[PDB]
Design a protein around this nucleic acid. Structure first.
Lengths: 80, 85, 79, 67, 82, 85, 94, 162, 423, 74
RNA sequence: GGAUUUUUGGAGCAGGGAGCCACGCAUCGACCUGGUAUUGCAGUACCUCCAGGAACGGUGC
């Protein structure tokens, strides 16, 4: 899929991820798989109550991701 | 024709999520699953304004460049024309 | 490396009594001895029980086939 | 496809599951569905030993080690 | 047999659709595709516990449909032929 | 495949279409649809006639729907009976 | 016990919760150089102790001499160079 | 060596030992705190140790900033609108700076979430009643100079200064 | 403690520095001011503007300066904008801020740290410099606003204020009218309305879709306005318009007809015989309701009105553009787009294989037994291993002497009987 | 037993009295007429037990596969 | 082309009452006062014990 290619393009960039449960994970995208499975590092997580935490290493299953925010560095795939 | 999505491409689009959020951004790409690419995207919670005399905008958040997974998409309508840029 | 399916094949052979965590239901879990299973993780359990974590009450079931849809987690119990 | 988890093999992990459930243990293996084998597993705390987690119900994992 | 094919024939009909999330949609079908993704025009959509909003166009992901209420006039026996 | 529609559990639907008999469909929406099966498929999508929809709100409610299409995922149970009689 | 990147502290008030202890330790020791990490457990064995790891070795030596017997949460801390090299240091070196 | 956008962009960025996102601004000889906008409110901690800053002021609105390590600088004054630009400031380490008068510490009363405060090695420390003054004027502080603010001190600070 | 005299001094000095900077700018390219001033002229009528000749010849006194391109003019205008912001701030703090034994007292402490070997030429130079990027001459932008980028404020179709992109709103409009009878040009014809926008409305002014649209559009036009004219005091304009809104309406709806009397703007949409009934209608439950529900919309409508009036030249300019592009061919339209693009992205100031390792025989599983049961990935590799240091060390230290008789060795055992055959 | 799988177990249970629990907590007792590849289920002389108590006597019934939690012979 | 990462569903349902203020049941967690033990070289679910306090937080019905 076209969006998937753009996701792989964001590998190595800082991205934000919201899960199906609304926890919000911000940090560096290390690896993005075809099914949207996401390996990230040096995370800041913001829970539904508002509290924050810090994690070194995480991996989130694609299905249980609601969405991702990518840099605007990418915006400039205009062919489609 | 397959066009029904391709028509609205480049347009500003109002997308409704399964939890009931409103994502408004520039519709730039989609796919088989309806995973969507939304440029200059904001999120609304309380309302979609039709000129609500009190205010039009409460709980608006600037997100930016958004990829939404199709699993969590419900529906889309045209919000405004393409920005020229 | 141990593959998850194989662990099950082990559970099967051992006749260890098994406790299953169900999907989106915390107040009840299921127990039994895996006799067989299939490609969808559907399980055939013997002398099975519903376990109410809240009520500390057990419901006796006997021969159970549990759809895999419900499987969150598989653990072994000494009992 | 396989999930890219070889990096996490034989490491201690923190697993967030659906139902607001959380467990911790050492990754012993996986398959293409992201079903996991977790050893020395602990329900968050009570020790449950070696267990199978179905990938279906895996929300998120976090390494408690450095990979 | 494949009943989505039947729905794909209903372009230019007006229908009421009830959604899984309870929302009610009344509009004119511009297109149903193979995933039952449905597109409409001249749409009056009433989310559960709101007054209707009117949209010139609306596009529904197929899975979110509960059911379609069809025109009483609709000649089903014709449409069921392949 | 026809054999599996003919003799398997879906024969309930196959039998209802052939005999133009009524069936009650317990439904995910907590509603029940009572009517005749004009068509059905693998997923239990159906085209229904003379549908009496019944539900509760305690207060019972009902409403008549002559012609309608049901997406099959909403199916919980489908009941055949001495209902048509 | 030769100079080390890591200092071993003991005689600490063990009533402070672990995350608060580590955060005050980080704050206090930041004045001498970047603290890479802090290892402190509340087990019976390890309670009242902590290992503070610095990027620079000069920072560890300065910390040791200047904070010897510093009143921390009520008790005078005792500082010493650690017996072994910290795992993090070994990984950062090779 | 002005604290500039360019400076912040090449600065070591990492997850610190207490699991927070921290920006390293140590040893640059910065004299004035400015242009923090460029960090984009992405840090939980900012390390300004060993610099030449004179006044703790000049911050943009930074909602995520919870820890400020300002060791070995020349802080002699604290800005007045700090809570308006740093609402969740919870920890402030000011060891070895130049605050000399008790009244110069007054602006810290407006930091509603401030819980960890360290002012050691500042001349102000040797002023009579320095500890009680801080406790009464900045009651939101729970740990002062790595010592627990206790009830008896609060009461004692309520008498004096009542 | 800190002598306020020094602080206030440094403040006045910095203010001086900024004034000098934006004055140097206004000097190199007078357009910067001229442009600005002209617009200002049509917002605050009193404003005195320079001799036309000066404007045209782009001169301030005697010297006619080189004409600059739009992107640069706008850039410098936004830079001057932030400069004026700084200035306003400093002016503020300053307003809020404004013996012998002590002289020797301080002069004594000045002896502190005598051994401070360092050259200090960085107070007025770092400021002067701070307001005047590249090594020598690549980027006009000052260090102060080095990360200032117009493309993050203007889209490509706006061309830094040349045009305003209304195609998007034409889309939304089609969505609003629920048809397609409306062309881009007919839409612009609609916009022109903005008494007309009040008494000859495109749609019914109590329609939802319509009021929402109008809101979005209004907002756009306003942001565009202030975006394209940084140099003019935004707050001044805002307040002017607001006061015109409040004061003009109250007596007679500002809109008066010799026949129908006095019209109500937005809330009621009705006329009134005389001013008397008009006033006693402004307290009625009806007008209270309406003015209490449709206030924001009415106000937004009004803003769209006055801001579109202030931008008449841009509106016309764009409509023109539309007609042009429309009357182009394919190649023409393409080349034009190329031009807009270039203007947009231009500097504001110009200066192995398996098929081979299988063929060669490598990356194939193999093992030498005598060497650590070692693995070798190629058959050519084995001969090299045999003429090797370690392989000969295993042989000779094993008691099996080196060189060429033992070459074909694999296992340790057989070459032992071979060496017994040797000796 | 020597490996007794899902599929054969269910096939052995055809012609028999069963009870099916659904995920939603309803229960349905009746004679299992048939099952199919997706594990959709057909009961005859069905009865409904909700809260473990006889609610309704229903007759012939199709249960969609995704609803099923487990099946018991009884 | 309905069997775990998307389109044939794990969804569905439950909050007012009393005089701006306050709230049923179950489970888990730090947590706060006193007092008390422990002086120990590590890589962490968590971490002394004893008594008192919870107008504390989270989840489910």
């Amino acid at each position: 899929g076209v969006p998937i290619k753009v996701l792989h393009e964001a590998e190595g960039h800082i991205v934000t991820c919201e899960t199906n449960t609304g926890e919000v994970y911000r940090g560096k995208l290390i690896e993005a798989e075809d099914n949207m499975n996401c390996q990230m590092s040096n995370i800041t997580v913001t829970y539904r109550d508002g509290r924050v935490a810090q994690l070194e290493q995480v991996y989130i299953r694609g299905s249980k991701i609601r969405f991702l925010i990518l840099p605007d560095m990418l915006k400039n795939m205009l062919k489609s | 024709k397959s066009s029904k999505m391709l028509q609205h491409i480049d347009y500003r689009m109002r997308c409704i999520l399964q939890d009931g959020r409103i994502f408004i951004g520039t519709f730039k790409a989609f796919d088989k699953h309806m995973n969507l690419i939304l440029c200059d995207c904001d999120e609304f919670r309380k309302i979609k304004p039709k000129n609500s005399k009190q205010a039009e905008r409460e709980e608006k958040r600037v997100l930016g460049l958004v990829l939404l997974r199709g699993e969590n998409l419900v529906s889309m309508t045209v919000e405004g024309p393409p920005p020229k840029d | 490396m141990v593959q998850p399916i194989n662990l099950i094949f082990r559970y099967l052979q051992n006749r260890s009594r098994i406790q299953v965590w169900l999907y989106e239901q915390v107040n009840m879990r299921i127990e039994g001895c895996i006799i067989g299973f299939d490609e969808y993780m559907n399980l055939v359990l013997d002398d099975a029980e519903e376990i109410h974590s809240k009520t500390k009450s057990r419901k006796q079931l006997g021969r159970i086939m549990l759809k895999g849809d419900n499987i969150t987690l598989l653990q072994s119990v000494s009992n | 496809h396989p999930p890219e988890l070889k990096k996490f093999m034989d490491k201690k992990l923190s697993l967030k599951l659906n139902g607001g459930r959380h467990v911790q243990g050492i990754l012993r293996g996986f398959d293409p569905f992201m079903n996991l084998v977790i050893d020395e597993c602990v329900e968050m705390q009570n020790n449950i030993g070696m267990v199978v987690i179905r990938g279906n119900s895996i929300i998120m994992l976090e390494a408690l080690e450095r990979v | 047999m494949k009943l989505v094919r039947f729905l794909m024939k209903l372009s230019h009909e007006t229908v009421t659709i009830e959604l899984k999330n309870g929302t009610q949609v009344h509009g004119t079908i511009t297109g149903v595709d193979v995933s039952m993704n449905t597109h409409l025009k001249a749409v009056k959509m009433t989310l559960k516990n709101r007054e209707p909003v009117q949209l010139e166009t609306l596009s529904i992901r197929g899975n979110n449909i509960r059911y379609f209420i069809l025109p009483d006039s609709l000649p089903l026996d014709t449409l069921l032929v392949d | 495949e026809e054999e599996e529609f003919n003799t398997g559990p879906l024969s309930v639907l196959t039998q209802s279409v052939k005999n133009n008999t009524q069936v009650l469909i317990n439904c995910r929406n907590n509603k029940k649809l009572l009517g005749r099966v004009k068509a059905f498929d693998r997923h239990c999508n159906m085209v229904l006639e003379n549908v009496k929809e019944m539900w509760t709100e305690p207060v019972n409610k009902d409403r008549y729907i002559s012609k309608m299409f049901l997406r099959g995922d909403s199916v919980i149970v489908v009941l055949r009976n001495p209902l048509i009689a | 016990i030769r100079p080390n990147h890591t200092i071993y502290i003991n005689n600490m008030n063990d009533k402070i919760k672990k995350e608060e202890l580590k955060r005050s330790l980080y704050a206090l020791f930041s004045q001498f150089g970047h603290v890479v990490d802090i290892v402190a457990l509340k087990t019976m064995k390890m309670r009242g102790q902590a290992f503070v790891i610095f990027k620079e070795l000069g920072s560890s030596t300065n910390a040791l001499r200047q904070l010897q017997g510093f009143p921390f949460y009520g008790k005078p801390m005792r500082i010493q160079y650690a017996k072994t090299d910290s795992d993090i240091i070994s990984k950062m070196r090779g | 060596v002005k604290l500039t956008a360019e400076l912040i962009e090449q600065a070591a960025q990492y997850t610190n030992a207490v699991r927070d996102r921290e920006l390293d601004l140590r040893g640059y000889k910065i004299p004035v705190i400015e242009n923090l906008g460029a960090t984009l409110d992405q840090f939980d901690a900012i390390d300004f140790s060993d610099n030449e800053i004179r006044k703790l002021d000049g911050f943009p609105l930074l909602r995520r900033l919870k820890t400020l390590l300002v060791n070995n600088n020349r802080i002699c004054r604290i800005g007045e609108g700090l809570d308006q630009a740093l609402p969740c400031l919870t920890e402030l380490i000011l060891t070895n700076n130049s605050l000399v008068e008790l009244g110069d510490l007054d602006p810290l009363a407006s930091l509603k979430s401030l819980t960890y405060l360290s002012i050691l090695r500042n001349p102000v420390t040797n002023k009579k009643h320095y500890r009680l003054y801080v406790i009464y004027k900045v009651p939101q502080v729970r740990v002062l100079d790595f010592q627990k603010v206790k009830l008896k001190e609060r009461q004692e600070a309520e008498k004096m200064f009542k | 403690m800190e002598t306020i005299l020094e602080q206030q001094r440094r403040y006045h000095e910095e203010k001086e520095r900024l004034m000098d900077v934006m004055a140097k700018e206004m000097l190199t390219k007078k357009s910067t001011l001229r442009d600005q001033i002209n617009s200002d002229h049509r917002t605050r009528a009193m404003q005195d503007r320079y001799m036309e000749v000066s404007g045209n010849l782009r001169d301030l006194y005697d010297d006619k300066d080189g004409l600059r391109k739009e992107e640069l003019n706008a850039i410098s205008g936004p830079n001057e904008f932030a400069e004026f912001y700084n200035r306003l701030k400093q002016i503020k703090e300053f307003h809020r801020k404004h013996f012998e034994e002590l002289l020797k007292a301080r002069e004594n402490p000045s002896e502190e740290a005598q051994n401070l070997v360092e050259f200090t030429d960085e107070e007025g130079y770092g400021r002067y410099l701070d307001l005047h990027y590249i090594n020598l001459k690549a980027s006009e932008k000052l260090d102060y606003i080095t990360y200032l980028s117009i493309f993050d404020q203007l889209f490509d179709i706006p061309k830094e204020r040349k045009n305003a992109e209304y195609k998007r709103y034409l889309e939304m409009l089609l969505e609003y009218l629920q048809d397609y009878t409306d062309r881009v040009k007919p839409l612009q014809d609609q916009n022109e309305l903005f008494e007309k926008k009040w008494e000859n409305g495109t749609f019914p002014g109590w329609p939802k879709e319509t009021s929402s649209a109008l809101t979005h559009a209004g907002a756009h036009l306003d942001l565009s306005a202030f975006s394209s004219w940084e140099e003019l005091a935004s707050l001044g304009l805002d307040r002017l318009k607001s006061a015109l809104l409040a004061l003009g309406l109250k007596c007679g709806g500002t809109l008066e007809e010799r026949a129908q009397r006095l019209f109500s703007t937005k809330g009621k949409s009705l006329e009134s015989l005389d001013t008397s009934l008009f006033a006693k209608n402004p307290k009625s439950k009806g007008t209270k309701r309406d003015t209490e529900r449709n206030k924001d919309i009415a106000f937004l409508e009004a803003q769209i009105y006055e801001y579109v009036e202030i931008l008449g030249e841009q509106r016309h300019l764009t409509h023109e553009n539309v007609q042009r592009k429309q009357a182009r061919t394919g190649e023409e339209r393409e080349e034009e787009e190329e031009e807009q693009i270039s203007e947009s992205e231009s500097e504001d100031e110009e200066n192995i294989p398996y098929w081979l390792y299988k063929l060669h025989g490598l990356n194939i599983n193999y093992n030498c037994e005598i060497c650590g049961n070692y693995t070798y990935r190629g058959p050519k590799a084995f001969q090299r291993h045999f003429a090797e240091w370690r392989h000969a060390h295993g042989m000779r230290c094993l008691g099996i002497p080196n060189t060429a008789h033992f070459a074909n060795v694999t296992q340790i055992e057989d070459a032992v009987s071979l060496w017994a055959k040797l000796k | 037993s020597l490996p007794l799988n899902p599929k054969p177990f269910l096939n052995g249970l055809t012609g028999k009295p069963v009870m099916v629990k659904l995920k939603w907590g309803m229960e349905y007792k009746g004679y299992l007429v048939s099952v199919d590849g997706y594990m959709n289920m057909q009961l005859a002389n069905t009865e409904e037990y909700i809260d473990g108590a006889l609610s309704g006597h229903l007759g012939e019934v199709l249960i969609r596969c995704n609803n099923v939690l487990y099946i018991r012979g009884v």
